[PDB]
């Protein structure tokens with residue numbers, strides 16, 4: 001079990017760690033989060049009590065180093081840092097645990113939610129979407145725009161998701177205009193799966209990462225990317241049966257976890273009614289259709 | 301953006317543009333079968349592709365053989381239209397290619413946009429006007445030639461005859477739309493108006509009679525009356 005210590009908590013802030021969150025008062029004796037499960041990526045995220053504008057946070061994998069949080073009063077935010085001195089770090093953590101000034105990652109044992117939301121998400125792929133190679137962890141916030149959003153302005157700070165565009169030469173073979181536009185299987189299976197992603201795990205990993213950035217930071221370009229990757233599968237007549245079964249499980253847990261009060265902004269009516277009721281896969285997403293109908297019947 | 305009442309004179313500027321109507325591409329008669337079920341029999345159709353400034357009518361005849369063995373024909377018809385429009389543009393030299401294509405029905409937007417991906421500098425636009433181009437098959441010579449075709453074929457007419465020698469393109473387009481609106485509301489009366497006086501003939505290469513300026517004013521007036529009426533005879537006013 002790993003730990004992310006905090007130097008201090010100088011400003012009042014809501015801290016999240018994966019799907020959990022807690023309120024820390026200004027100058028409360030908070031020194032971090034312990035008992036973090038190893039084997040999964042994680043996200044630690046922040047909303048200041050003064051300026052709920054800008055949710056921001058850090059994706060990290062405790063197997064890639066020792067990481068801590070330290071508030072920077074010049075840039076005005078909680079920053080993740082790596083500690084290279086291994087003995088210095090174990091020493092800091094042990095002292096903080098002894099004084100019991102760390103909260104515990106509060107995972108219930110029956111609960112597989114975080115695994116089910118991050119099953120295909122890898123740090124190495126996060127780091128190619130979020131390019132900042134001097135760090136082992138990745139910063140994301142509400143305002144970051146996507147590479148495709150920037151084609152339609154600071155490149156260093158972009159989300160480099162895979163560009164999907166249904167009315168593009170990449171998507172449409174010459175001479176198959178109608179066929180490829182109404183049945184996107186060749187764009188899904190040959191262009192994206194075989195060509196760009198290599199396998200469905202990498203595709204699912206980017207889909208899951210896009211959802212999580214949409215949910216935790218309200219990142220609009222990430223929500224666009226999540227729906228695009230859903231729609232590309234739903235609009236394909238020919239999808240490996242294993243991908244369809246896994247997609248149903250993936251979306252089930254995303255819909256289960258979404259806050260009921262954010263569904264108005266985070267869910268796109270058109271994509272969902274197409275996936276569930278018009279598309280080739282209208283009969284293939286049983287778990288997702290049942291949870292959507294019982295939790296968001298208004299949307300449909 | 302969309303073409304409408306406010307940006308109407310843009311049609312007659314010097315940027316080349318084509319109006320594409322697909323209404324008459326897929327045409328059927330509906331009949332009973334021996335068993336008492338209903339079936340369709342397709343008949344020849346046409347794409348109506350018009351330069352509103354010069355009057356060029358590129359009439360691509362759609363022969364019923366293109367539907368043989370195909371499913372979902374109303375949807376195919378939109379993609380076939382877009383295929384044929386893209387082919388016409390690709391044939392045209394770069395300086396003669398249109399900068400805009402305005403489709404008369406919104407369902408043509410995505411089929412045309414996909415077929416024109418090679419032409420990113422050609423704007424595809426809808427319109428908010430309820431233009432009467434469906435009535436082009438009420439033009440005797442058009443109805444007759446599309447029905448005589450035994451194979452796919454590209455037929456050419458000037459839908460303004462020689463009008464541009466005497467009037468502007470704005471005025472010619474307005475005259476065309478009035479004639480077509482009339483033919484669409486009451487084809488019988490409209491055609492009676494146009495051919496009542498035997499002394500006014502149609503030249504071999506023209507669609508409409510050789511009216512003098514003064515006779516056109518009378519004609520245009522009669523077509524207005526027709527349309528107001530049929531609106532009464534329909535709305536009881």
Ligand SMILES: CCNS(=O)(=O)c1ccccc1OC
Pocket residue numbers: 356357358456457458
């Ligand atoms: C080519 C027969 N003359 S026309 O005026 O009817 C015409 C129709 C279509 C395209 C160009 C045209 O003229 C240059």
Ligand SMILES: CCNS(=O)(=O)c1ccccc1OC
Pocket residue numbers: 503504505
């Ligand atoms: C005066 C020619 N006009 S035409 O284009 O309609 C035509 C062409 C060739 C032969 C006969 C014709 O018409 C009767």
